A paper describes a structure:
[name] is a highly conserved, homodimeric enzyme that reversibly converts isocitrate (ICT) to α-ketoglutarate (αKG) through NADP+-dependent oxidative decarboxylation. Tumor-driving [name] mutants catalyze a NADPH-dependent conversion of αKG to the oncometabolite D-2-hydroxyglutarate (D2HG), while typically ablating the conventional reaction. D2HG competitively inhibits αKG-dependent enzymes like TET2 and JmjC lysine demethylases, causing DNA and histone hypermethylation and cellular de-differentiation. We identified one mutant, [name], that maintained weak conventional catalytic activity, drove robust D2HG production, and was resistant to mutant [name] inhibitors via a mechanism not yet understood.
While [name]:NADP(H) showed no major global structural alterations upon alignment with previously solved structures of WT:NADP(H)13 and R132H:NADP(H)30, local shifts were observed. Unsurprisingly, NADP(H)-bound [name] had the typical open, inactive conformation seen in WT and R132H, with a larger active site cleft and smaller back cleft relative to the quaternary complexes. These distances in the binary [name] structure more closely resembled binary WT than R132H, supportive of a more closed, catalytically competent ground state for [name]. In particular, the clasp domain and helices proximal to the substrate and cofactor binding site were shifted, with the α1, α2, α4, α5, and α11 helices adjusted upwards and inwards in [name] versus WT and R132H, resulting in a similar shift of the NADP(H) molecule itself in dimer-based alignments. Importantly, this inward shifting of the α1 helix is a feature of closed, catalytically competent [name] conformations. [name] also contained longer, more intact β strands in the clasp domain, which plays a major role in maintaining the dimer, compared to WT and R132H. [name] [name] also maintained an extensive hydrogen bonding network enveloping the NADP(H) molecule; this network was far less robust in R132H. Together, dynamic and static structural data suggested that the [name] [name] active site pocket and surrounding features have greater rigidity and more defined structural features typical of fully-substrate-bound forms of [name], suggesting a more catalytically primed state for [name]:NADP(H) compared to R132H:NADP(H). We now believe that the more activated, quaternary-like state of the binary [name]:NADP(H) complex helped drive inhibitor resistance. Instead, our alignments showed residues 111-121 in the inhibitor binding pocket, which form a loop between the β4 and β5 strands, likely had a larger role in the loss of affinity towards inhibitors for [name].
Residue numbers in the entry:
A (entry chain A): 4 to 135, 139 to 272, 283 to 414
B (entry chain B): 3 to 134, 139 to 271, 284 to 414
């Protein structure tokens, strides 16, 4: 077996909890031994520990640099009643993101025989937004001037901008800000992401409206690029380029994918089971990977009733491969790195060979026309993945 | 005899849409409807020659007559100023008109059974109304205080909020506002939109974060619904509900369309995107296509090259305006004609006759053959033939 090293694992809820264990038993543990720091973020354990397990897991990722998380229940009124919760606990992902900070990158796994939004997309597209509300909103009770002013610490200037003169009645108003350091982090993660995946980085803004707000982003990116990054980019045939929201969307419809897209926003096509997410810290050392979808409660309800389920494990699987990939990069572990990529290859190869779960079959043929013989159920698909994994690894040996 | 349509304000536009606009009036409207046409030429040359006076006048006419249908217009930039030697960079005509009329813009894509849509589970299009810029942004060069103050006009105590204290480094800051009247109008237009279409209404905000800012939207929407629209909504078996933006995106993706989405704050064929400005009064509306003047196709047409521009959005501007005019005047004949024009457009495409953009949505642009679509004039002639036939069969 491979010596994988230190990995922080977080267990989840409902259907993903089941798939998670299938992944560990069929795909990971037979080939990788890990110094595994496992945390049970199941809803009942989070309630029992008064959410302490969530904080402990966050600190564990901070210490060991690699975290892979299963989907978790974010409680609401119904969940509080269903589980007899003591509190409507905050989402584990919010707690973890707030402890680690960083930038989230979403990337949908592409298979040739699965329709994409843009027919021409051959390579993936990695979209990134910064994990930051810290905004001061208030009620304007009646007529009067709302103004926003800046005063430098040296007190040599004072600038006052009229936000609005309320002359008929009141309303609402707010102010919000952004620190340079937070914009710089967003850019560092974004450039390191483009270098890691070996693709070009595009930044899109709306400088035609918030000329000053978005212009600061444009400048901070260009500064960092031309300073510490331009070199590596020209080396790998990649580059950085700023785009307006229109020029960017256009360049995407005509493009073949294969680029990082940084957004200053203030999730659709392709089954949710194909979407991956990665929290990348500015330091470039810490990564937390996980599927972009949820616990799949509906499929779990079928399971509980004893009905066949067909749940896509790809996003969950790619959470492990990304985490193991980063762990291998940190440890210079060529064997683990080879495994992580082999597992990714096998998943796509199996789907592209026609073995797939119902969601993907529906994407191809349309749900009203899918037949039982068009797909595999949850356990059949995991079986096929494990079978092709064993073949692939053994064949690589020769 | 033709139908007596009444008073309509019409606004002529630029480039490709101007060509198609005239074909629409000649082939689909005028052969069947007589209008008291208040017609204004918002072509770039006429706006310049009148110093944009025509644009303001058109807005006043809509205010007076309640119904307006507008062709897409060139919004000037530096390149347009050079191309036409403009006296100056005239403001977007839509900006002038919205400023004069107020109201909320609602966007709706026209759904054809045989054109693939974003979520294949959307049977009926979804109508999205948006709010408004009005953001005072600026750069923070270095350490210092950014504060936002409220100064009452009656002399009482000034109120000051800290936005942020930049202790080291700089960044950016911005201020933003919303007047209560503005939110009330947004709600009223939205409720009227939902009643008119007979569909449910959903307001999406982030009132859990912006507790006071977005909370004001949700509160005003609810108070106006309970006092002015609850019963009417029930009398049509519809409803209004607030929803957090995340939950709303969830409900929408699993839904089959058919609802109005008001959100404070999408890639189909632009040729199928419709737009309507709905004033809160419930009387005045202005309809236009969601796309622009299609300059690229116009350059083709200028060199005598074959074009295939989609007129659907332009056609639905006319049908929505005429439908509102019919409602205002209790004009059963015009109401039917407007419905017939919309169905004939949908049916022609659903029968396999379409412009190149929709053929691309089916075969993909790389494999679109000339025999897969009609050019602009071929498609317009096909619509005319089918409209003629439908209206003949409608007598009995
Ligand atoms: N990262 C996290 O921890 C996340 C937490 N959640 C939690 O999970 C639950 C969400 O349930 P829901 O709102 O249904 O969102 P889910 O993403 O859990 O399920 C959404 C729906 O999309 C389809 N789908 C999603 N993942 C898969 C998959 N792997 N294979 C096949 N189909 C899939 C299914 O639709 P169909 O049944 O039509 O196939 C499923 O019902 C809540 O408790 C929420 O708090 C949700 C989001 C993220
Ligand atoms: N309501 C208004 O008055 C509006 C004004 N404008 C003005 O109009 C011009 C806009 O030009 P542009 O920026 O190209 O935006 P357009 O929407 O005019 O053209 C956009 C592109 O989308 C496709 N497209 C749009 N409408 C159609 C259609 N009816 N049938 C087929 N394809 C269509 C074409 O792409 P392809 O050529 O690849 O098919 C077209 O080149 C500018 O002068 C702008 O100021 C723009 C926005 C709204």
């Amino acid at each position: 077996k491979i010596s994988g090293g230190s990995v922080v694992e977080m267990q989840g809820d409902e259907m993903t909890r089941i798939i998670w264990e299938l992944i560990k038993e069929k795909l990971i543990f037979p080939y990788v031994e890990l110094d595994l720091h496992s945390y049970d973020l199941g809803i009942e354990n989070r309630d029992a520990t008064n959410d302490q397990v969530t904080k402990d897991a966050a600190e564990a990722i901070k210490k060991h640099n690699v975290g892979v998380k299963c989907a978790t229940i974010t409680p609401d009124e119904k969940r509080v009643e269903e589980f007899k919760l003591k509190q409507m606990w905050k989402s584990p992902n919010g707690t973890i993101r707030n402890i680690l900070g960083g930038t989230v990158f979403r990337e949908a796994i592409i298979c040739k025989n699965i329709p994409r939004l843009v027919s021409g997309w051959v390579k993936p597209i990695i979209i990134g937004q910064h994990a930051y509300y810290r905004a001061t909103d208030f009620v304007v009770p009646g007529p009067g001037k709302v103004e926003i002013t800046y005063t430098p610490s040296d007190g040599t200037q004072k600038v006052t901008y009229l936000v609005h003169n309320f002359e008929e009645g009141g309303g609402v108003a707010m102010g919000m800000y952004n620190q340079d350091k937070s914009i710089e982090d967003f850019a560092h993660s974004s450039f390191q992401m483009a270098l890691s995946k070996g693709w070009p980085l595009y930044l899109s803004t709306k400088n035609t409206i918030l000329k000053k707000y978005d212009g600061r982003f444009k400048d901070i990116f260009q500064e960092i690029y031309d300073k510490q990054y331009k070199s590596q980019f020209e080396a790998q045939k990649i580059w950085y380029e700023h785009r307006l929201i229109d020029d960017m969307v256009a360049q995407a419809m005509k493009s073949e994918g294969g680029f990082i897209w940084a957004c200053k926003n203030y999730q659709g096509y392709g089954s949710l089971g194909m979407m991956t997410s990665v929290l990348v810290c500015p330091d470039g050392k810490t990564v937390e990977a996980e599927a972009a979808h949820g616990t799949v409660t509906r499929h779990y309800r079928m399971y509980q009733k004893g009905q066949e389920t067909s749940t896509n494990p790809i996003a969950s699987i790619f959470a492990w491969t990304r985490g193991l990939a980063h762990r291998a990069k940190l440890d210079n572990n060529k064997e683990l790195a080879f495994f992580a990529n082999a597992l990714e290859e096998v998943s796509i190869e199996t789907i592209e060979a026609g073995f797939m779960t119902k969601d993907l079959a529906a994407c191809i043929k349309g749900l009203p026309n899918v037949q039982r013989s068009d797909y595999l159920n949850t356990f059949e698909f995991m079986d096929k993945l494990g079978e092709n994994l064993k073949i692939k690894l053994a064949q690589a040996k020769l």
